[PDB]
Amino acid sequence: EVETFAFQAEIAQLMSLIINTFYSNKEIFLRELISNSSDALDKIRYESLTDPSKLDSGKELHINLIPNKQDRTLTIVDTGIGMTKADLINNLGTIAKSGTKAFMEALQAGADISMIGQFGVGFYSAYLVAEKVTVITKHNDDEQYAWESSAGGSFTVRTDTGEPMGRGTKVILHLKEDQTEYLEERRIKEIVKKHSQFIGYPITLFVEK
C-alpha cells in the first residue's frame, strides 16, 4: 500500500525555486546531504550514551557514497538515527516550513542558494541534480519506510520490502540526464575534499563495477 501526500505550500515553493532558478553551483547538494547524515549520526551517538541498546541495530557510525551508472543514481547511505513514519511525513516537514520562510526571505535580501544549509532545509538541494529522490530509512522501534518525490507538490510513503538496513537512511538520487558528472569518482572526491573534509565520521566512496 502506497500513501500519497501533498507537501505543505512552503516546501512545494522551495522545491520549485530549487528546480527553476538558474544557478550553476549545483555541487553543493552533496555537502548538504552529507551534513544531514552527520546530524543523524550525531543523534544516534548521543542517544546511545544513555541507552546503549539503541546500537543493537548496528555499532558502526559511518557514511557510504555509492555511484551506479547503470541506474544513474548516486546513493548516500548512513547508519544514523533514521526516521520514524512521523519524522518522514510530519515532523521534519514542520521544521522545514519555518526554515523555508527564512531562506526565501534571505534570498530576497541577497543570499544565494549555497546558503540553504543554514536554514535547515539543505535536504531539498538534492533537487539541483536529481529528477527524483528516494529515501529509505529505518529508525529503532519502527518499520523500514521508503519516501519518494519527483516534486510536483506530492510525495509517497510505503513500507519498504528491499534489503533490510539495520538502522539508518539511504538517500537515492535519481540524477538528471545532464548531471551524470556526480557519478564520476574524481568528481565526487573533489567535492567531498572541498566541502566535507572535516565530517567526524568515515566517508567511503564506493567505486563502480
Ligand SMILES: COc1cc(Nc2cc(-n3c(C)cc4c3CC(C)(C)CC4=O)ccc2C(N)=O)cc(OC)c1OC
Ligand atoms: C537534522 O536533524 C535530523 C535529521 C534526521 N535525518 C534526516 C533528515 C533529512 N531531512 C531533513 C533534515 C528534512 C527533511 C529530510 C528528509 C525528508 C524526506 C523527511 C524531507 C525533509 O523535509 C534527510 C536525511 C536524514 C538522514 N540522513 O538521516 C533525523 C532526525 O531525527 C529523527 C533529526 O533530528 C531532528
